[PDB]
Amino acid sequence: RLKGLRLELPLDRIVKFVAVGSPLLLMSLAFAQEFSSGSPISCFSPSNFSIRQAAYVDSSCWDSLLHHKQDKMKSLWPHKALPYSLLALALLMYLPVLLWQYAAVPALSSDLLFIISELDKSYNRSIRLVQYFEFPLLERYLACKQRSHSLVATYLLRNSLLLIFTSATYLYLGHFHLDVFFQEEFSCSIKTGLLSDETHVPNLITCRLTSLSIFQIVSLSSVAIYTILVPVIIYNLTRLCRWDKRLLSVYEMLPAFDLLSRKMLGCPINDLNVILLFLRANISELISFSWLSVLCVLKDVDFMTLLA
Amino acid sequence: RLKGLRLELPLDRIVKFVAVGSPLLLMSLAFAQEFSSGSPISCFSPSNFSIRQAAYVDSSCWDSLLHHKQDKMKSLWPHKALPYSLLALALLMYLPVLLWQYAAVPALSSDLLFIISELDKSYNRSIRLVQYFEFPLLERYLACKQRSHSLVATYLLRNSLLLIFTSATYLYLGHFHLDVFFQEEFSCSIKTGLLSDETHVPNLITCRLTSLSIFQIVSLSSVAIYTILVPVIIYNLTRLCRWDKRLLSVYEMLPAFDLLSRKMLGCPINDLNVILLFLRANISELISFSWLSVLCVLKDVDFMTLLA
Amino acid sequence: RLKGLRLELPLDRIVKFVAVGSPLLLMSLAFAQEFSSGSPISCFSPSNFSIRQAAYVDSSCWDSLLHHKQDKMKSLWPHKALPYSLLALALLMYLPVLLWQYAAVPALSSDLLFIISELDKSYNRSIRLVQYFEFPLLERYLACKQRSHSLVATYLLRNSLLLIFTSATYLYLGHFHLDVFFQEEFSCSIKTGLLSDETHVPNLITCRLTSLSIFQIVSLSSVAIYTILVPVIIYNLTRLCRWDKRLLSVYEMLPAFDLLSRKMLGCPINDLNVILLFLRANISELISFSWLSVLCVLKDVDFMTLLA
Amino acid sequence: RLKGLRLELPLDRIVKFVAVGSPLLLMSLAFAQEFSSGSPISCFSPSNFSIRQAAYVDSSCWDSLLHHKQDKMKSLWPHKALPYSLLALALLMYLPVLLWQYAAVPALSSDLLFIISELDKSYNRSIRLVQYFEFPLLERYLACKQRSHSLVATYLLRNSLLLIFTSATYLYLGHFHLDVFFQEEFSCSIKTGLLSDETHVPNLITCRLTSLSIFQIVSLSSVAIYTILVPVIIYNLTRLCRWDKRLLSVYEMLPAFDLLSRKMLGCPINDLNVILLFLRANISELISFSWLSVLCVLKDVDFMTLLA
Amino acid sequence: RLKGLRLELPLDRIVKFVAVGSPLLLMSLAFAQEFSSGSPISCFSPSNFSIRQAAYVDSSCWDSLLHHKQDKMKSLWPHKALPYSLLALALLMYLPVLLWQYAAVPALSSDLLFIISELDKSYNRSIRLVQYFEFPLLERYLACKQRSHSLVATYLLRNSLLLIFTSATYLYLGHFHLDVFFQEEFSCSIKTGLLSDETHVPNLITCRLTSLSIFQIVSLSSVAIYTILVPVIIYNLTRLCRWDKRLLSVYEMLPAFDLLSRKMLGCPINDLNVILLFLRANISELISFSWLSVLCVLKDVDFMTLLA
Ligand SMILES: *[C@@H]1O[C@H](CO)[C@@H](O)[C@H](O)[C@H]1NC(C)=O
Numbered sequence A, B, C, D, E: 001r002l003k004g005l006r007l008e009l010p011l012d013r014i015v016k017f018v019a020v021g022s023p024l025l026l027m028s029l030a031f032a033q034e035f036s037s038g039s040p041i042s043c044f045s046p047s048n049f050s051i052r053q054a055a056y057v058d059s060s061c062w063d064s065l066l067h068h069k070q071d072k073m074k075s076l077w078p079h080k081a082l083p084y085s086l087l088a089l090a091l092l093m094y095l096p097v098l099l100w101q102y103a104a105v106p107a108l109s110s111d112l113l114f115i116i117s118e119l120d121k122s123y124n125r126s127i128r129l130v131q132y133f134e135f136p137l138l139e140r141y142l143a144c145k146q147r148s149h150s151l152v153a154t155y156l157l158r159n160s161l162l163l164i165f166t167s168a169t170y171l172y173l174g175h176f177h178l179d180v181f182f183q184e185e186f187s188c189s190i191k192t193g194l195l196s197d198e199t200h201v202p203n204l205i206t207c208r209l210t211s212l213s214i215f216q217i218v219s220l221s222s223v224a225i226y227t228i229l230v231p232v233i234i235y236n237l238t239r240l241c242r243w244d245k246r247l248l249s250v251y252e253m254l255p256a257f258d259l260l261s262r263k264m265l266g267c268p269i270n271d272l273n274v275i276l277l278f279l280r281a282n283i284s285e286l287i288s289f290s291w292l293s294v295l296c297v298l299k300d301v302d303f304m305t306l307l308a
């Protein structure tokens, strides 16, 4: 029971898992469908070229990735940087979580263990007493926690960082991947440099990109996935903005818990909200919190004074 | 015994397993029989083309996937989107189950554990008494559960989501894969764009799709599998519509259980039906429910007042 | 001892294992000897064709698999559907077993556990008594089981399903694989569709199938294996038709067991036969059934009244 | 608890992990994108060359990697030494850590175990006494440790070695990888040696490097990663320069601990700072340090003389 | 504690690990960069040769590896024997260690176990006595060990063998790999034997070695690594030449240990030095040697007569 503590809500965990796995899935798709068919470019070299010269033209145009529209010099860099760039995004998706693992895990774990121990002690004391009432240690600890703003700060910072990263991805896709999104074929010239005076090669060679459809699908999948993901992040952020009133009558099962929950009204930015959410996520400790859930469900002289 | 609890019926589990594994099996078949023979297209380039130019024509026609019937511009997109699209379907098949894992598992598990503990206590009390009769806690809990509509809502929503996804797959197959289901060969033109003024290539190049038979088999397998799967989902949905009368005499083994089962008649949309189905699936707890099964089987002064 | 219970006879288990593994072995052989040498077809394209045009003719004739005998239009589909079709057969071989796992395993396991517990109790009682005689619970349970027809129905249905599937495979092989069993080479025309007006290709191109011998060997192996397998299924079916008289004197070791075995004569379609077969398969529980085997072997005042 | 001791701060551990994994990640990228497309060079051999002669020219120019600008003889060695050189860097990143594992781990571990044992003993003594005050062993050990300069020397040496290695990498990149950073194509002559009198090959053959973009990306990633990493190393170095005053009131929980912490002011180069940092990293030993954290948090007659 | 005994110093272990792993790392590099690009030779066969004849010339010149400078017949064997030769070196690096594992491990382990048992017994006796003084068994054993010269002989022989092997590698590199270290291209004649009268092939064919740079890097890495490794071996050898005076005051913690350490001065070739080094490496047995380390550190009426 003690070792089964969860440091995050299941919704937040699954959101992080999706936001990390989707870029890696696209990475696997790219590295599987890119180098299993050669290179993502095929160049229509003239007939008089040998096979080696055609391969050289292919490699040179793949490396240059320049457009010679006519002098316009538009570039098509993203098609070659599509995997690696997304890799950075993956690392970005793993940046706040590590922060959460190195800024709130120890304090939250210690507080949760202390709170669960005090809850077990209070339950045992109530069991003995039904057959002294108030806790000064818990009251002082709750009064202190109602003033600190550490865990709430870490939570809001993590969510804001994730939202900012998603917005940055939106800006990247909407600024770099729509001026190229309809480029089927492009000209390419290898008449720059030492081969300038050569007359054996044409001035302009057309080449069509093979992986255009794959790139389009990857971009659309990314934007759709992050559009689906953002509202859940918004909901997880606004969950802290509303107090845990839905379980207030639950705290009524013990008048001491009610006194701890006296004057819960106030500004919802405090450690208390996070603690309440985590204990709600931990309402199945071994059997005792299950009994608490049963009694609060049936509550909605009670149960002949708790079976005496 | 406690750790061996099952959160779903074996029929529902096997249905989910089939509905998830079949798209993945088709994915494996597609990625195995598609890129082990090159690309799923072969283009009859003229004899004067070199090998590199023929490969360029092949890649360009594979990417474009356009038809120039004669100006008609029908497309043949699904043959290139057949795997990826089905992948979404796979994710869809995994969408409701996660919902079931994040909307009913904790409450159902807690209720099942509490019910099994109370059943063990009642069995021990009856064993002591045969050698006080009524339970107020169980009566109140059953009265409360007869009013709630949470687990029934989750079950019906999951089944409805699965049925809706199957219907959507039916619509997709019947709207996109029959206008292409008899396309052996198609024309393709690379005379669009920079190569417009080139006179070294023909205006129309015919190409025949290699993976036509594989695509046909995949579509037929999908439709047949989901046709086989839908009636079992219908049966699992209608199981809730009929009360668990088949075991009513079983509840007669203890008059307290009969009183709990008093007035079972009513509208069958309640948590009680799901609880009854799960306890029926859990009639082999350690040895005691086995003894209950033996006694109810032989029942169909009884057994000299339960061996005194 | 309790966890080592077997839910099927070793002969039935090995028959199922063979019937499942043989199609998968043939699948492995097909996918290993088919795509390790290219495609199972080689087409004698004329000399004037380039390599790309020859490959296109190869792929087109492989996909079409048509015969233009001369207009006759016989097809040679099975050579391309040989693996996938057999895969269905494999699933068919796994269909009844799952039925057996979802229609008789729980009831049989519960009954076997109860019977073994009662046998241990009766052995202990006899050991105490040799140094009250009749069991009413066991007598009533055996009387009830002599009337039910569930496990016998499941067993007969499983065996009938397996036999029907084998007969269907026989019909498939004898109706589809003998009109093709001597097709070495076949004509193939790609002059259908857009290439109709082309004069660069011949009207008829001959192609010889590479995997003819492999297909012949696979078909012969399948028919031989299922011919070897069917009589064992017949024997397993007829085993139920004869009562377990071979161990009747074994039941004489205890007169209570004889009274349970009183009036064993009757129609052999009952749960009792299956229970007797399974307990015969479980005559080595820990040491006690071994002692029973020793005493019944030596039986063929006995053993000075069981060593007093 | 005893076996869960940590020998380094989480920030230092993650910094070392990044500094080791990044070169290995670049190594994997290089060996994956270099030999999956042949060799990182394509040479425009003339048309009259056969395929074997073209391959020989390719290999010779790849091995020579010389430039014949016109006699200038600039070399382009790094493009061929890019992986192996970075491998040395990886080993360099693993050099100080091994030093830390072979110069401070045993003494630090022994001191930490002794200190934690004495802390447990002092806590037990205080618990007994609240319901003799000073420790001479701990006082003498702290007085001795305030004079030694071993662990501080090892820590500063490790950080200085890492900083020096990073500076060396900076110098290497800024001295070797900017005179080549814009070399797309280069001439290459195989008319040196035995082929000097041959007239079948040209005097100068142009070749363009395929992996130019990959090399550029690798260099930029390396410099950016180490720029991000250096300030954290600076912070970890300057952490020792400031005394652990933030927890001084924590030492006030026991006046004996305060007396141990008497005259903490002084020059911050001593083993005491490292010991304080490690015990701060170990403020969650089993439950007792958690209670200490709770009491020091709530402190900011106290707690009715520690619950009496 | 008993099972955690170390049979070698960490420095010696890491030196052996490096000296074994470096040749294997070079082996992996050679077999990875040699046969992933064909063969380490490319021969400029004339244009009139077909591809098969060019491949035959390539293979023949690779096998012969002869030089026909002009009749000089210098050979270039090492480029083909570079991996296999180094493999012998690897085995050589594993030769002395096995000797150390089969000439000193059992006796050293037995002596260390006996010594640690006697040390524990003496510590317990001192603990009892502080609240008979001399050991005759230990005194006699130390007197006997001061005369034997077995473990010292094995240690010196192992170090001398490693040094001799390193010197042999130095001689090999300085005698075989500098007359070839600047061979880019070499002539090769296949006009020896049956093809002597053939007029279809030239008399001399030039070939350039592809793996020249790789061989150069391997040789330089080997020489640099062994240059770095030799001084540590020298230090490990000279460590035995100086007595363990640095811990003499440590032996003063017990006057019995001092008497055992009486007359430590003498010629440093004895088992006693190795035993002292190993016990110094084992000063963290469970907790007791840690306490000894603490007391000897704080020593630099003592500690109120060891806390009485
Ligand atoms: C090959 O065709 C090109 C036109 O793209 C021409 O410039 C070149 O001279 C031709 N070479 C030969 C050998 O025919």
Ligand SMILES: *[C@@H]1O[C@H](CO)[C@@H](O)[C@H](O)[C@H]1NC(C)=O
Pocket (backbone or CB within 6 Å): B046, B048, B049, B199, B200, B201, B202
């Ligand atoms: C090759 O044939 C095509 C006809 O498809 C023709 O347009 C082209 O000029 C021909 N080229 C040569 C070099 O024969």
Ligand SMILES: *[C@@H]1O[C@H](CO)[C@@H](O)[C@H](O)[C@H]1NC(C)=O
Pocket (backbone or CB within 6 Å): C046, C048, C049, C199, C200, C201, C202
């Ligand atoms: C090649 O031979 C075929 C006969 O199969 C003939 O129809 C075609 O015209 C020939 N083409 C050439 C270029 O010789």
Ligand SMILES: *[C@@H]1O[C@H](CO)[C@@H](O)[C@H](O)[C@H]1NC(C)=O
Pocket (backbone or CB within 6 Å): D046, D048, D049, D199, D200, D201, D202
């Ligand atoms: C091939 O062209 C080269 C010019 O690069 C010339 O030196 C050589 O003699 C030519 N050889 C033949 C056989 O045409």
Ligand SMILES: *[C@@H]1O[C@H](CO)[C@@H](O)[C@H](O)[C@H]1NC(C)=O
Pocket (backbone or CB within 6 Å): E046, E048, E049, E199, E200, E201, E202
């Ligand atoms: C090819 O060239 C070689 C010169 O290296 C000459 O000896 C041989 O006779 C030539 N053969 C032909 C068929 O031109």
